[PDB]
Amino acid sequence: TEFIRFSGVVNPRTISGSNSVPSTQVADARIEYVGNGYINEAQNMGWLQRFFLNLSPM
């Protein structure tokens, strides 16, 4: 399952005639595109590898 979430503030005069506004005209734009399932877990680092990436000398 994939989730696309959007939030922001829109000026009414930036909305086009077809009730559309580009995402670059939204003030506090919060855009999120995430997923779950084993596909999403396959894109997470292992805990040991994350620990090393954060605490290894090099």
Binding site: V9, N11, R13, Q25, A27
Partner: protein
């Protein structure tokens, strides 16, 4: 009521909370370089292969 709104004037932000689009276009490039050099070569020689008798002592 949202107050007085000009008819023909371009839509500009005027009060707190108004939105404005910033087109981020930055291109900065600075450079500097310098060098210096100095050289000096000197060779000198003198040889008397055959010395006449009256010059021998010298």
């Amino acid at each position: 009521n949202y107050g007085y709104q000009p008819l023909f004037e371009d839509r500009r932000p005027r009060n707190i909370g108004d939105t404005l689009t910033i087109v981020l276009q930055e291109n900065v490039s600075a450079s500097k370089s310098s060098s210096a050099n100095a050289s000096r070569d000197g060779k000198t020689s003198f040889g008397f292969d055959t010395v006449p008798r009256y010059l021998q002592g010298l």
